[PDB]
């Protein structure tokens, strides 16, 4: 049966249960000094003995440079499944693989990621696996991956299962609290009169941002709404009208002191049609809205210093712009295109503060086939996909770029 | 209903109907002189007039650069598709995105994965579509991925859809005969003694290839069969054991004239286990096997010269390795592992004039939803798997290194 999944409330602790953290390699024990205030740690012993059930596992696999070595996965975790929590969260942190140094060394940091999908497949009770990079260049203290951590390690992560998390070099600052991570942060997000990007307000709001809440003037009476409720602005406007740019900078400058920190480029349409049967009204419509309104408004307001440093951009690709779907070749090329402008501006905004990453929805309750083949048996909720957008957006994400991350339950459909 | 897809025998022509290449890029016009010897090659018209069906369709996208122009994908396909014969071949070639030059460049060139996997789910009876992206640095000839459009372009394919050809700056030579094109090469193939492995050793001799055939002593009887009808010979041997690379230098110096130009790194074992219920042995021997060895015959075989000049190395990897599979714990860390291995050595290997690619089967009849989910709706056969080892083998494929592809009919499930 499917686990009725634990989510996020303000003011809850991040975990059910205890966290323990294990592995030789040079991650462990920063990690360790980092969470100790706001997580309940506990240590591997001999006896497996513990009090309380996991409600995290984290094994540093970064020592690891042989195939031999790989061994410890299996003397790590296979004494410690029995005792997870509902809703668990493992997790096995390594080497950006091409920086791992030797071959054997890329060879095994690769390799964990079998390890980590087939491990996904396995876990019990609504428990989800993460496999995270930290690049060979990150300091001892590793506080680039904390966001990372926090985010894996908590309820908001419920429905984001089996993925890869790729962290650089850079350190970070923690958020003043990591309770309101948004907190003074001004988010632009598009779509939002309703449906996901709806809901993005809502949980941006609930981390402290102050939204500015964008949709066509024909959803005008929703998109007040939402931005009433959530304490923020609503901005009717079309994204691809040549003055979408001019309208959100003056606005942020009359209402939100001139600045955007967060941009979501969730506006989309679809014009379905199998290829055979397209026209160009079809074609046109979708790359307009969905590929050149997101790389307008991003390298528009970056031009113009609206976005500028502490940023962070983040585009909703989907399940068609990785596996493909019939009758989407326009829908699915705009969604590609959206993983493309995050792969292609990642080093260019690098030089201005600012990072870009992609968010590509699964199987969101917004059939049953859908709904249940992924490993959490279930449909994902909208609330799911906005804490993985909330997570890039997070102040303390500036060491997370140019990233593509799927909030699907680890679904089976992929490339 | 599955289409019956058109396979290769030897003598066949490449394609039933004729090849269209278009697109203004820079490869439609020297792949047009590349090919016009031995494929039927015809033009866009205005008229919409051709005598015959399409067995290919050729797109040259590496001119598009914005958004806009990814409308020629629609206005060159759209009034083509009616024309296609069955099993036929939709290809487009574009840019490695990373080498496209500008950020919107490389935007659009990452968006055409989008676009092919798309199409690849509406294409009818039983053809597919292809994605192969070239090296920038390329000459204007483009000899380099002659042999990755020879092999899409014909029967060989058949159950190779949707996928990322991934070829590089190298110039290539013809073999003296496309249709023997290992002829004089000696072919070392693991696991040979049945299944996949046997029809490797098949299609390698049909090639022209001389195959030594390895498996296990105690598969010696089925491996002599094998070895006499491809014209090969047999090495009964534990690809585990320490003297497994002097046994096969020692074989081929006897019989071969002492090189080993392809290694297929193919035997592999599973000892599924949850995890939780996993013991050492069940680990051990899958690391052992899967990925210990094949680590050790290609760096054994290159470190004494018996892989050399010309030289190609094939891994087998699997879904289990990109997807992860229930209690695969051990055998997905082995198979994401030869990815490793691909991604790992193949900068290495660069320097001495070899290549080294993996390949993920699908599903393959050696069960109903494994057989089904995938465009083609029908699994594989053993044949399609060596058809994709037997292209990255070909003395032509110098430009083609650290690909994984999938041979898989474009299944459903992935990452
Ligand atoms: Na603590
Ligand atoms: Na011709």
Chains 1, 2 share one sequence.
């Not at 100790?36 to 001999?46: E, W």
């Not at 991570?181 to 309703?194: C, E, F, H, N, S």
């Not at 967060?262 to 989309?268: E, H, Q, S, T």
């Not at 712009?321 to 990642?346: D, F, S, V, W």
Request: include cysteine; aromatic fraction near 6%.
């Amino acid at each position: 049966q499917p686990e009725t999944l634990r989510r996020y409330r303000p003011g809850d602790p991040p975990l059910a249960g205890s966290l323990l953290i294990g592995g030789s390699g040079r991650v462990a024990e920063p990690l360790r000094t980092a969470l100790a205030d706001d997580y309940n740690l506990v240590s591997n012993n001999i006896g497996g003995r513990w009090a309380d059930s996991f409600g995290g596992v984290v094994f540093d696999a970064t020592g690891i440079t042989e195939a031999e070595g790989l061994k410890e996965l299996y003397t790590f975790f296979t004494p410690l499944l029995r005792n997870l929590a509902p809703c668990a969260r493992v997790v096995v942190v390594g080497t950006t693989p091409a920086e791992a140094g030797s071959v054997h060394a890329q060879v095994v940091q690769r390799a964990l990621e079998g390890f980590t999908r087939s491990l996904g497949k396995e876990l019990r009770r609504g428990a989800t696996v993460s496999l995270v990079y930290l690049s060979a260049d990150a300091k001892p203290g590793a506080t680039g991956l904390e966001s990372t951590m926090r985010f894996i390690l908590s309820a908001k992560s419920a429905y984001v299962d089996g993925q890869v998390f790729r962290v650089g070099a850079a350190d970070s600052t923690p958020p003043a609290d990591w309770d309101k991570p948004l907190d003074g942060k001004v988010a632009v997000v598009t779509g939002a009169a309703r449906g996901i990007g709806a809901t993005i307000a809502e949980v941006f709001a609930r981390d402290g941002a102050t939204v500015v809440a964008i949709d066509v003037d024909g959803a005008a009476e929703d998109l007040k709404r939402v931005a009433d409720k959530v304490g923020g602005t609503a901005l009717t406007l079309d994204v691809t009208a040549d003055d979408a740019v001019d309208k959100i900078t003056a606005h942020v400058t009359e209402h939100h002191g001139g600045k955007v920190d967060i941009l979501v480029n969730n506006a989309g349409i679809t014009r379905d049609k199998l290829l055979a049967n397209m026209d160009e009204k079809r074609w046109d419509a979708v790359i307009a809205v969905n590929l050149l309104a997101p790389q307008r408004l991003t390298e528009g307001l970056v031009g113009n210093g609206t976005i500028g440093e502490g940023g962070r951009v983040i585009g909703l690709s989907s399940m068609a712009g990785i596996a493909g779907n019939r009758g989407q070749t326009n829908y699915a090329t705009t969604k590609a295109g959206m993983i493309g402008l995050a792969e292609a501006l990642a080093p260019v905004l690098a030089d201005k503060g600012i990072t870009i990453n992609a968010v590509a929805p699964g199987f969101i309750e917004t059939r049953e086939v859908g709904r249940r083949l992924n490993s959490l048996f279930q449909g994902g909720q909208p609330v799911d996909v906005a804490e993985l957008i909330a997570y890039f957006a997070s102040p303390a994400s500036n060491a997370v770029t140019g990233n593509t991350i799927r909030v699907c339950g680890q679904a089976m459909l992929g490339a």
